[PDB]
Design a protein around this nucleic acid. Structure first.
Lengths: 91, 79, 90, 89, 90, 79, 88, 91
DNA sequence: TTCAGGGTGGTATGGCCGTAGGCGAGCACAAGGCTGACTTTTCCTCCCCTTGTGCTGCCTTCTGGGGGGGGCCCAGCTCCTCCCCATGCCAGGGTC
DNA sequence: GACCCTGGCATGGGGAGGAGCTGGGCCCCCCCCAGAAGGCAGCACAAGGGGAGGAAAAGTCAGCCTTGTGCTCGCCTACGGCCATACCACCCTGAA
């Protein structure tokens, strides 16, 4: 479908449905879901690549909230982006 | 009077997590009031949400929204 | 001498909750009874409140430590707490 | 809940690494917060320019407003690539 | 002493603009050329940027004055400015 | 270097409005650095709004929105 | 946008007091700010409750959540008096 | 808004709510309620600022007086805490 | 002169009653890990003194901002086309 | 396994575009006078050193009460079903 056709791994259809039912505009284009899905995929991949390195630093496979807190508060851009976010049980 | 439930060792632990190397003897009585006002604000907002939902049971989503209304987004208790 | 530093390390390498859950729950219910009688709660609402309050107090204490280092001190005080709170807005 | 796709992304980037339920819940709140951020901003832009359709441009400008510096640069490049490839498929 | 107190009183009782308009406009244009070349500005855009920046600086100096008073001082200093900015968040 | 146009007397007047009684010698440089992170941010937000609107003239409304989205509302320069 | 309407209220509580053309530029940005705040909160209350109607209740709960202690106490009394007069 | 003893545009706030994309539907009590709330806040502001302007031997409200009422009223100060009143000064 | 308002059909939302189960209040019971009280000391905070260095009050120059006066042309607003993007709705089946 | 994602078809409407038109933002010029800037005398206030006392940190010990487990009960809340009327879209009017 759109998810595979855009070279992605996120639900383009679900993002479009959330945009349409979210009352973000009277109408929603046909490229906004594809753009949003790619942005979210990139952000999630960045965080899961930093948290993966943080966890492998402690020689641990499963990623726990502390690993995510360490990655977010270590990387500068993610720190200022989520500068008002409480990563529960993160430290 | 259940405000003493926030005992001196708990406040000391919260301070030592914050890098505090020494604590005055009047910090505890003031931190109790700080916690009281913070809790009163968040709980009033959550109770307002619950009353709007014509419920009688506060929920984690009520608390999360009550915290988001003042800039403190909580990650984890909504999934 | 080293007890304070070792406690700082121990409580800054762990992510546990540093306020006892039963007294925190009793305080939360006492505060809520001032708003609505016979108001129930959850096993995740109280936990979210505990996590939020502990993170807020930890941040407040880091800023209070900064205020104490400002005044050429290592002992935090209600003056330092008040200065931190006034500057960040509360 | 984005658990399936976050799992797929994690196994894509880190082939052998796993993840816990609490970290999954944290990421499924992170995504639902960022989505609302970039959607509220694209709604602000659409209302400001008195338009009626959120499109790739509104999402682009919202990303540039929200994500700082290299995050916005890389995300906007990723989105441009995605929508460019979308029309051919 | 009395001169500083009288200046404080006069500039607290007054509401005028404290930075000179043309140099402020040259600063604004200098900064904006990096974001977009050959850009243009409505005069009210600069008149709003000024009334935002000056109030921002006034608030920052109020917080810095609190920081200076904390250390038992009357002189405000760069370290006090940075402390106020850290506690605020910037 | 049109930041030097934010002269020492203007900074002293702003400090006196704030309530400052004495001022150090490096406060001027520090305040110039502080002002050119406020301008360099609000102007960037306003210019990206203008570029989205395909315009080439920043507007009072662009500035007001760029100020409100960073948590600093302006009253008067709108409509 | 509301310049006329503030004058109407102004002539009631301050019959002899005029207002500048720079002060009314604030109140036009003040009503535009409070209205968007309350209506931006009464629009999120409905989404939590999986609803689609901003009725009189969703406004009142949005007023209490925004207005401070004693501001929110007479606003939900004067405001309540409006709906019971316009309905009946 | 003479039907509800107001001086605000109930019809205009109804139209703004309807076109604001704030919901799929808008009730028939939200316009009146929000108009009355807006009217109460307006009256409070131009009562405090009016008293302030009378205390300054002036017959006209000005931004300096508006920020002399908002800042000297603790409820309004908390409400408008992140507001830069133009041409207001500090006190 | 466009926007607020009266009357009407339709339907999609929302209210009323049932209900049945999940889960939240609630009562016992250790027990042992944690809090509370005491003691000691020692280390830090507060007060004093001195100073020397940096900030300030006052003068004087000159310089550059502010107040007009004028031009113009460049960009933002307006109106009409229309055609292409997006949507409303029904059915099949892929995925969460 | 079920439900909504996409495919397909019919369709109103929105925005991309082409002119035009004019408001104001930019550029230049002139003047001139109030404020910025460089200097110097003077002082008073920030910082370094020293002393003391008192108040937290650290260790010890006894007790107490959270909590980890168990079980009960009943109340809340989500889902269902049905239906009542409130609000919206539309046509016209007249008003601020």
């Amino acid at each position: 479908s759109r998810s595979s056709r855009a070279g992605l791994q996120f639900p383009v259809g679900r993002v479009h449905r959330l945009l349409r039912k979210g009352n973000y505009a009277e109408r929603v284009g046909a490229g906004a879901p594809v753009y949003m899905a790619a942005v979210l995929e990139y952000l999630t991949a960045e965080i899961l690549e930093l948290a993966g390195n943080a966890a492998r630093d402690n020689k641990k496979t499963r990623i726990i909230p502390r690993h995510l807190q360490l990655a977010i508060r270590n990387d500068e851009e993610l720190n200022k982006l989520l500068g008002k976010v409480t990563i529960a049980q993160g430290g | 009077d259940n405000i003493q439930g926030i005992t001196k060792p708990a406040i000391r632990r919260l301070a030592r997590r914050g890098g505090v190397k020494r604590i005055s003897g009047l910090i505890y009585e003031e931190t109790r009031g700080v916690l009281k006002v913070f809790l009163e604000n968040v709980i009033r907002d959550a109770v307002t949400y619950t009353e709007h939902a014509k419920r009688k049971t506060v929920t984690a989503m009520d608390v999360v929204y009550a915290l988001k209304r003042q800039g403190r987004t909580l990650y984890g208790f909504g999934g | 001498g080293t007890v304070a530093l070792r406690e700082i390390r121990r409580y800054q390498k762990s992510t546990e909750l540093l306020i006892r859950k039963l007294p925190f729950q009793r305080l939360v219910r006492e505060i809520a009874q001032d708003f609505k009688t016979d108001l129930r709660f959850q096993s995740s609402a109280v936990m979210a409140l505990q996590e939020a309050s502990e993170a807020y107090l930890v941040g407040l204490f880091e800023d209070t430590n900064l205020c104490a280092i400002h005044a050429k001190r290592v002992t935090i005080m209600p003056k330092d707490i008040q200065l931190a709170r006034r500057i960040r807005g509360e | 809940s984005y658990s399936v796709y976050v799992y797929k992304v994690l196994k894509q980037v880190h082939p052998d690494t796993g993840i816990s339920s609490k970290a999954m819940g944290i990421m499924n709140s992170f995504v639902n917060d960022i989505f609302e951020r970039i959607a509220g901003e694209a709604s602000r832009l659409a209302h400001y320019n008195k338009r009626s359709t959120i499109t790739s441009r509104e999402i682009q400008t919202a990303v540039r407003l929200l994500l700082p510096g290299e995050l916005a640069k890389h995300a906007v490049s990723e989105g441009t690539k995605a929508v460019t490839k979308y029309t051919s498929s």
